[PDB]
Design a binder for this molecule. Structure first.
Ligand SMILES: O=C1N2C=C(c3ccc(O)cc3)N=C(Cc3ccccc3)C2=N[C@@]1(Cc1ccc(C(F)(F)F)cc1)OO
Length: 191
């Protein structure tokens, strides 16, 4: 056993995982979010908190734009919760096809662009401090204990590096397939 290629869209925990993220993204409790806000947030984090160059920020923005665009979000459009989770079925389906065709997934392309900013050595592997810095700036994780759970789930020691390759596997299983080996990837921060 090496992974999982089947979706699990009727699992209430898959829906609730993305409901948690929709609420985390819906910072003004409008019940709706826009692609404008998603790409603003992405560039706000990497430029203003993580010291990214304009070129790095552009690469990272294009990756985030394509990712939420793959879930049906568009510029100038407010996406409510039912439109969001329905669009995420399409995003997860299109990603699993690329995954199964051994094509670079949208989540992998996002990871490359992000690791080039977060990793000071820029070889595609991040330290535990670098993962704490990214997730706490984004807010997806608040406590350092949850950041350590990421290293436990990726079977990397806390003193080691986290590569895009192992992270992509866990993220595909955490967001797309409900892979039981990827549970607790964000500790207690994300159901
Ligand atoms: O994957 C991730 N994220 C996933 C989600 C998310 C949002 C909504 C939703 O419904 C489901 C998930 N949000 C965020 C937070 C966010 C949202 C908007 C703008 C800026 C930040 C997020 N940051 C990520 C970045 C990342 C991507 C790829 C890889 C890999 F593995 F490829 F190398 C590792 C890490 O860190 O984990």
């Amino acid at each position: 056993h090496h992974g999982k290629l089947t979706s699990d869209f009727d699992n209430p925990r898959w829906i609730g995982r993305h409901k948690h993220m929709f609420n985390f993204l819906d910072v003004n409790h409008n019940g709706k979010i826009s692609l404008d806000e998603m790409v603003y947030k992405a560039s706000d984090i990497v430029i203003n908190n993580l010291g990214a160059t304009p070129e790095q920020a552009k690469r990272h923005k294009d990756a985030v734009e394509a990712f939420f665009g793959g879930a049906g979000m568009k510029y100038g459009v407010e996406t409510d919760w039912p439109a969001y989770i329905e669009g995420w079925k399409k995003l997860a389906t299109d990603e699993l096809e690329k995954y199964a065709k051994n094509e670079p997934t949208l989540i992998r392309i996002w990871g490359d662009a992000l690791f080039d900013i977060v990793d000071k050595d820029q070889n595609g592997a991040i330290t535990l401090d670098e993962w704490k810095a990214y997730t706490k700036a984004a807010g997806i994780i608040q406590s350092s204990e949850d950041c350590e759970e990421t290293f436990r789930v990726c079977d990397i020691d806390e003193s080691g590096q986290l590569d895009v390759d192992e992270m992509t596997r866990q993220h595909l299983g955490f967001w797309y397939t409900m892979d039981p080996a990827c549970e607790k990837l964000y500790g207690g921060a994300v159901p």
